[PDB]
């Protein structure tokens, strides 16, 4: 522990919307300092979303205006993608970094496969 809770795969309808669940149980002392969602490009995970102390940042142009990440509940950083294209099919990684009172950082990630249907 901690671990992220992310399904092995999700489906979304072509031209519709999809939610990629990424949840965790908040732990006493583990302050969330970074959230990233990444898309797998061969051997390279590529950041598409970053949440840091300055706010939310969409890091790949093709997701601009189509990407939201939950923020209202501690431990729910699920990703929502709208107007799905067939070219959105990929493996997506949820990655959360926590910092403990001593300054140590702990990182966890987990992969889901997004399939776009119909």
């Amino acid at each position: 522990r901690p671990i992220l809770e992310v399904p092995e795969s999700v489906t979304g309808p072509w031209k519709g919307d999809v939610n990629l669940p990424c949840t965790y149980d908040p732990l006493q002392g583990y302050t969330q300092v970074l959230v990233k969602w990444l898309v797998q490009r061969g051997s390279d995970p590529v950041t598409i979303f970053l949440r840091d102390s300055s706010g939310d940042h969409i890091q790949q142009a093709k997701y601009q205006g189509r990407l939201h990440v939950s923020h209202k509940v501690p431990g729910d950083v699920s990703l929502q993608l709208s107007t799905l294209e067939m070219d959105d099919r990929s493996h997506y990684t949820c990655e959360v970094t926590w910092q403990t009172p001593d300054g140590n950082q702990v990182v966890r990630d987990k992969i889901t496969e997004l399939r776009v249907q119909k």
Partner: nanobody
Amino acid sequence: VQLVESGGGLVQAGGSLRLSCAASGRTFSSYGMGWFRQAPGKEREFVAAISPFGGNTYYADSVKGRFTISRDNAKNTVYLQMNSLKPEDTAVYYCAAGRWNRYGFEDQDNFDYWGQGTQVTVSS
């Protein structure tokens, strides 16, 4: 997903063994695979891991330069070549599978599937 280990047994210090682990399913390449070990009276500890996709490899510091992990995705098989074996390497070795990518591969809670283990004994 079922995981089945092969290999193991008795070897002399300085010798070597190859362990293997076969996985069911059809999405093997997207799983990170790991090896863990447990000696009697001690807790289970990380040995090596290999990431999904590009297959980055990670090793406990005490096995770096001695053990090598690799995978054959067309065979759903992960291998552990344990060279330069020492009596301190005596333990039951377990293969495991999870959906981590670059982080958390040392944390046993990050692996959802486990084999029953194979015993390795290194005699001096």
